[PDB]
Amino acid sequence: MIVGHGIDIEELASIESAVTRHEGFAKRVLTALEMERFTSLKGRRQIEYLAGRWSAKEAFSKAMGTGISKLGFQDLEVLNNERGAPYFSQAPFSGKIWLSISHTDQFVTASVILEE
Amino acid sequence: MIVGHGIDIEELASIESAVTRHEGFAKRVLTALEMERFTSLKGRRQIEYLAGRWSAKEAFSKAMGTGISKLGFQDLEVLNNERGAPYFSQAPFSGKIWLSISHTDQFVTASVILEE
Amino acid sequence: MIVGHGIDIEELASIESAVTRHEGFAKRVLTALEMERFTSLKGRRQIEYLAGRWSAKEAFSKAMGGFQDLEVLNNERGAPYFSQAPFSGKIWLSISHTDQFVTASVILEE
Prior knowledge:
The structure is a homotrimer.
Chain A: E1 2-11, H1 12-21, H2 24-29, H3 32-40, H4 43-63, H5 68-71, E2 77-80, E3 86-90, E4 96-103, E5 107-115
Antiparallel strand pairs in A: 1-5, 2-3, 4-5
EC number (chain C): 2.7.8.7
Family (chain C): Belongs to the P-Pant transferase superfamily. AcpS family.
GO molecular function (chain C): holo-[acyl-carrier-protein] synthase activity; magnesium ion binding
């Protein structure tokens, strides 16, 4: 049984601009574990990682039927499983969370399906 | 059980150009209730509302296996609930309609999953 | 129950460059039947078709967890669907595109 669906599309430029401005951005969006990978990356990949997590969390919030400003970015965490795919390691949902993220050199998209 | 899935992306610019070559464009795309919302917004947000409604209605039509021009714009209605999330208040479907909409400065995407 | 979910966004440029780089790109990405369609098309519509197929197959591959073993055709209503794929459950596919990129979404259900 499906109990929610959310999607999100984001321009990487907006994320790169945010990072270039205040250093506190990535920190607000990512947990400690996520920051570990974020800081281990270089150039485009580094921005893409952050953008993807932002998009995934935004998509999840919509899947729950609300805004990320109510859940909070630190309330969610996206790591990579043994098969290398991104997944919610932390989220206020008990069922299965189907997540998928994809990007180009200009956009990142994410889709979330909550299942019970 | 899932009975349909559809996604759609619309360029805001195309929507506005349409609002230009056809003065009554909005009126034909939106229901009376959607029009009342549309007429209360302005600038970018107004266009985004209209474009997002088009995306949602097309995503749904594709989820039903067809197109919006065939299904009819007036037979679909997307309003916003108490939490501000878009949802189908009107549709020729007896099951659950899981809708999500997201946009950038230039595009708006919608994803619909139908469930019985 | 859902057993997989995958999406993809692909810029038309990556596909356009790929076609030129190796003329056999399309042939490698598309099955015989898909190629027949590709070849019958021209210009932007032709590129879009190739990009949409690449996108859909990528989305499917990500949903599962050779693009020649995957085939996406169009039904009588014009909607794209997987006619061939290493999965016996239901494959819910949807593709959409702008002038610069294509997106695809796949949900696998049993």
